[model samples]
Target: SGAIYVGNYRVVNRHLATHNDWANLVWEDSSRDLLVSSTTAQGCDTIARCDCQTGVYYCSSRRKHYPVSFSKPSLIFVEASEYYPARYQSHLMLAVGHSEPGDCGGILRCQHGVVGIVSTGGNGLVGFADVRDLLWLDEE
Candidate 1:
């Protein structure tokens, strides 16, 4: 995922597994101004522009332009998804480097911005889980 600031809103780029590219414009404070643009490799055949103050969105596709609106609940549902492993790895590394040892079973609780826990067994092997803050994880 990639994101850019357009006016006061943040536009996020999402390339789905179905080979579709979307530009999702999200407001910093509210969901009313949320807009989405969908296009293929052909380029931005569709665009959604939001009114900064009014929280209204105008969407134009190959056919025509129209006003679009959605509720906060709807946007929240769409935003829900799985964690990103790459983000977890970075947090895991930071946690392991800085965290204090745990209370029992040689558990080391690591927390560097995002939190993670590493457990070392008697064999000197380590196991980690419960990595957090995966939202900002990218393709890298």
Candidate 2:
């Protein structure tokens, strides 16, 4: 929905990924990829996913191509461990100390044009997000 198309396809470029477990997807998903859609929004524009840069990755086509912008506030790493800190904790560190975890794993539409660490099993919102928003596993 929030994308530009290349003929019959939605143009996109990969951004960041670590290829860890839970980070998988079904068409049906990365568990998700940090995909940059073709658009002109902040953090959405292609700093040229075509050029190789460290802070960015994914797309590397020499041609000036792009899809729409897929920039949202969602994190896809959640198999908790004793040694690891909660993934969304970083987001929390930034004044997001409230509202927090998951839609489990699937295509979530942001109703208010906002996306967050929300879930039905945890909470019940996308932009209604931050409602329960508990980490993959929750504190509740």
Candidate 3:
């Protein structure tokens, strides 16, 4: 169990808690990666998994996948209280691309679309037009 602070947000590893919806899906071997889902209907059914094996993170979704690898994979979670401030809604950060000096990569919120972090240098959101169950293990 560890904590990561970003801007006005404080994120912790789900493992620190007794249980969580996506905690079990975390690849312990590559625990650096984080998975986030959208709350909007457009992307409600899809989940994005960030791969943090190399300096650059690779993100993939159900509809399609892309890269924005100028930065390393640095993911953190936002508590429900901090996320909504008034309500109970939790969220996670997905690296959108590179960032300024000394910071972890650029971060994006999971909203109406799925954002992918690539290494080749680019960034954008992919729509959620289909439904697909995605699961995998990080061996390396």
Candidate 4:
């Protein structure tokens, strides 16, 4: 978890960011009281930092708080064609289920660390943008 921009997004107070990643109908207020963890629900002791591989998965958004026991990481196409991603590259978490589109931009965390950001999802599957290269915000 990090600073979440609040207000009438397609969903409410969506997209927790360590960097400025969006814009909307008007400037909005934010929630900094939020904190996230790679451990458990309400175990928000850390923030976005990804270390890719496989393990259980965790994600939190104003709309969702979920967990799935995911297997190995695979090359997954996110949000472009039915086959692959449109622009940003993403990885799929196999066997994980029921993540929605509103889950986008949330952090994908595990015991090792945050491995990605929610990018897209469908059916019983989900995709995440690899966040290993993204620098943590300088604020803290």
Best candidate according to lDDT: 4
> How does candidate 2 score on lDDT?
0.22
lDDT ranking from best candidate downward: 4, 3, 2, 1
> Mind sharing the TM-score for model 1?
0.19
Q: Candidate 4: which stretches are off by over 4 Å?
A: 1-52, 56-66, 69-75, 79-95, 135-140
Computed on alpha carbons, the lDDT of every model, listed in order, comes to 0.21, 0.22, 0.26, 0.42
Over the stretch 1-140, how does candidate 3's per-residue lDDT look in tens digits?
A: 22222222222222232344244333221132233311122212222344332222322332222343222333333223211222221222233443221122222224322232211122342111110112321111
Per model, state how many residue pairs clash: 0, 21, 5, 3
> Model 1: which residue pairs collide?
none
| Candidate 2 global TM-score | 0.19
Task: Give one digit per residue, the lDDT tens place, for model 2 in 88-107.
Answer: 32211011111122212122
TM-score of each: 0.19, 0.19, 0.20, 0.44
Look at candidate 4 and give me any clashing residue pairs.
Answer: 36-44, 37-44, 50-114
- Candidate 4 Cα deviation (angstroms), residue 42: 20
Question: Cα miss at 82, model 2 (Å)?
Answer: 6.4
Single out the weakest 10-residue window by summed lDDT for candidate 1.
Answer: 52-61
Looking at model 2, report the run of 10 residues with the lowest lDDT sum.
49-58
Q: Which parts of model 2 are misplaced by more than 4 Å?
A: 1-88, 93-110, 118-140
What is candidate 1's lDDT per residue for 1-140, written digit by digit as tens? 22222223222312211122223322121122112233322321112222111121111111222122211111111222232211112111211121112311111221222122231111222222222222332111
- Evaluate model 3: give its lDDT: 0.26
